[PDB]
Amino acid sequence: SGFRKMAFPSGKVEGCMVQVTCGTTTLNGLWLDDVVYCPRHVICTSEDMLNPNYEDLLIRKSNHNFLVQAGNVQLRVIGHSMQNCVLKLKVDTANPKTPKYKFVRIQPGQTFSVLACYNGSPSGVYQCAMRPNFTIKGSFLNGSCGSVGFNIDYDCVSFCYMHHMELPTGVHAGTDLEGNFYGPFVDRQTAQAAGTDTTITVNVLAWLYAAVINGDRWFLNRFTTTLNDFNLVAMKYNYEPLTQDHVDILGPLSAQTGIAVLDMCASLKELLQNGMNGRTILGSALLEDEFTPFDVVRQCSGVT
Amino acid sequence: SGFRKMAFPSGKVEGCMVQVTCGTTTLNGLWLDDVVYCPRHVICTSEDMLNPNYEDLLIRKSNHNFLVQAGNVQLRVIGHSMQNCVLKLKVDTANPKTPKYKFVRIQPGQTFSVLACYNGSPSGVYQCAMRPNFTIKGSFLNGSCGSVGFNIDYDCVSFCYMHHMELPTGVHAGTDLEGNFYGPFVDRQTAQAAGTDTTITVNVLAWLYAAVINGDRWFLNRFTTTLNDFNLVAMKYNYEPLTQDHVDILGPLSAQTGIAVLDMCASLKELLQNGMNGRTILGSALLEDEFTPFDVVRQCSGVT
Ligand SMILES: O=C(Cc1ccc(Cl)s1)Nc1cccnc1
Numbered sequence: 001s002g003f004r005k006m007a008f009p010s011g012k013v014e015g016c017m018v019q020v021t022c023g024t025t026t027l028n029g030l031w032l033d034d035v036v037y038c039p040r041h042v043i044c045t046s047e048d049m050l051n052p053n054y055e056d057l058l059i060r061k062s063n064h065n066f067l068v069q070a071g072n073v074q075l076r077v078i079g080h081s082m083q084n085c086v087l088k089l090k091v092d093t094a095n096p097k098t099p100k101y102k103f104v105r106i107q108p109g110q111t112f113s114v115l116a117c118y119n120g121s122p123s124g125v126y127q128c129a130m131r132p133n134f135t136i137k138g139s140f141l142n143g144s145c146g147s148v149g150f151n152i153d154y155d156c157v158s159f160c161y162m163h164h165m166e167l168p169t170g171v172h173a174g175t176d177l178e179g180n181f182y183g184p185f186v187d188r189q190t191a192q193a194a195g196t197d198t199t200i201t202v203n204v205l206a207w208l209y210a211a212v213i214n215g216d217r218w219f220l221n222r223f224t225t226t227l228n229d230f231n232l233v234a235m236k237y238n239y240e241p242l243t244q245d246h247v248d249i250l251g252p253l254s255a256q257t258g259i260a261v262l263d264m265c266a267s268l269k270e271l272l273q274n275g276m277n278g279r280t281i282l283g284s285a286l287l288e289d290e291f292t293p294f295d296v297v298r299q300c301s302g303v304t
Numbered sequence: 305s306g307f308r309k310m311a312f313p314s315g316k317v318e319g320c321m322v323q324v325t326c327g328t329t330t331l332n333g334l335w336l337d338d339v340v341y342c343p344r345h346v347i348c349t350s351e352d353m354l355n356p357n358y359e360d361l362l363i364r365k366s367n368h369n370f371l372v373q374a375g376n377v378q379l380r381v382i383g384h385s386m387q388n389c390v391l392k393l394k395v396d397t398a399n400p401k402t403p404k405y406k407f408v409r410i411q412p413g414q415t416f417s418v419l420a421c422y423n424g425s426p427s428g429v430y431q432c433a434m435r436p437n438f439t440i441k442g443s444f445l446n447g448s449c450g451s452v453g454f455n456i457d458y459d460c461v462s463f464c465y466m467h468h469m470e471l472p473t474g475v476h477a478g479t480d481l482e483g484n485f486y487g488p489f490v491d492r493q494t495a496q497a498a499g500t501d502t503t504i505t506v507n508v509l510a511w512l513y514a515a516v517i518n519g520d521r522w523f524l525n526r527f528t529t530t531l532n533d534f535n536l537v538a539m540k541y542n543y544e545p546l547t548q549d550h551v552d553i554l555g556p557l558s559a560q561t562g563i564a565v566l567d568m569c570a571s572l573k574e575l576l577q578n579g580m581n582g583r584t585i586l587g588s589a590l591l592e593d594e595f596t597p598f599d600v601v602r603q604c605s606g607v608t
Pocket residue numbers: 041049140141142143144145164165166172186187188189190305
């Protein structure tokens with residue numbers, strides 16, 4: 001028993017972290033096979049970031065201008081190309097530590113681990129969620145760009161995110177491993193404001209199931225609700241509308257605890273309308289939305 | 305910017321996780337050099353745990369009874385000994401992935417990362433703190449015993465904890481890497497109740513500094529306090545007494561923000577007496593006590 005914001009073991013991803021220097025800019029790269037992936041703003045100076053023309057800026061860069069360093073050895077760059085907002089630096093040596101991997105573009109609400117890096121060296125690992133407004137609430141500093149988000153299925157790593165930028169509101173924006181930004185963000189130093197940060201309803205419900213499985217049951221009540229009734233209350237509190245699909249995904253959690261999904265929605269509805277009244281659920285004084293139904297089942301069953 | 309409960313990269317520790325089977329009991333072991341460390345209750349059956357005599361139970365066990373498996377290869381056990389509540393299984397092969405390591409016994413209030421394992425395979429990583437009552441609030445299931453807690457200083461791993469047991473209150477108890485339990489716990493299936501879980505005051509103050517550094521300043525007030533005044537309020541709310549030593553340790557955080565430590569104590573005093581009034585600090589609706597002053601400086605400066 002016990003519930004923690006648990007990240008995937010980062011070992012497989014540490015072996016892929018390299019340092020990419022272009023001029024005076026140093027950031028992190030992801031070395032998989034003979035390719036090093038990094039954010040394309042490595043070729044920019046602070047001033048360039050105001051109105052960058054990446055195709056133009058790229059012309060002035062050659063293979064020998066990108067300094068790729070793995071640990072303390074230098075990698076030879078034999079080719080470079082821009083795919084969307086990521087640069088792909090083809091090196092002559094394939095990464096001996098390349099795990100089985102996939103590049104996946106996640107949906108908002110989905111969660112993943114982040115291995116925060118600086119100078120290609122990992123410094124920490126935390127569990128994040130892709131917010132419904134396509135931002136992430138991470139912990140990134142200058143030099144952290146190129147740090148990646150990932151999921152693991154036994155031995156295969158699914159890379160889903162690369163960090164690119166901090167918006168003026170302190171939230172984070174990045175791309176998938178094909179260079180496409182999540183959301184409407186662009187790699188420019190301009191006025192970019194995120195949309196409403198709604199709460200991931202299916203994730204709070206999963207975490208309420210996780211609490212019940214661990215002994216925290218005070219929030220369980222005698223009431224039930226319907227999808228349309230619950231959603232009228234979810235709308236008012238900036239909670240994502242709950243669909244029959246989310247209900248189905250909570251099925252295994254509903255089965256293990258014997259609490260029908262609509263009964264847990266009615267509990268969540270009361271928590272929304274009345275607050276926690278100074279109480280805690282899983283040691284948290286607010287409704288946690290960064291555990292998916294899959295994460296609860298995984299943590300509660302011990303998937304290695 | 306941004307503040308996350310960030311764990312150390314687990315790669316160096318994953319390379320040390322092995323599976324230890326003794327009879328029908330399988331748990332996790334820590335393979336450093338030619339020694340495998342595991343909880344001594346590997347030699348017990350569920351029934352034995354009521355009143356175990358480990359020296360007696362150990363006599364009936366030989367080198368060939370301990371099955372040590374690293375990944376999928378079997379390790380040959382050429383010696384075994386009991387040091388306090390841990391077994392040390394000497395194997396013939398030194399772990400090629402042995403990082404630079406130390407065995408340290410941490411103080412309560414100190415924080416560390418946990419690589420939760422099952423069948424010697426890592427499943428997740430989270431950041432914990434050794435509570436003042438010598439328990440930890442982790443996420444451990446059956447099969448998790450032998451999972452370790454650690455800190456990293458650049459490339460050296462300081463192993464500080466091994467998981468041994470879940471108390472009936474769902475909290476966790478374990479030993480340092482010499483087999484000595486933290487707190488008054490014993491590896492018996494008997495009535496063991498933990499003491500008061502007090503809040504780590506110096507850690508909340510550090511996290512208030514971390515919030516100020518990230519833009520969350522609403523809790524800053526016009527007041528100050530003294531160590532004795534603040535402590536009268538800390539006593540009432542089950543907060544650890546703050547010493548001049550804790551004040552000195554917050555010195556670098558006080559210097560970076562320009563907020564005197566006693567001014568932050570007065571802010572904390574108001575938060576204790578009046579609550580958050582529905583507000584959040586660093587996205588948390590309660591006062592977080594699992595970041596030490598060292599962790600704040602590390603996360604906020606990017607120590608790799
Ligand atoms: O945002 C940048 C670099 C950029 C400046 C202007 C851009 Cl457009 S991208 N670094 C950063 C710093 C702290 C946390 N996350 C990211």
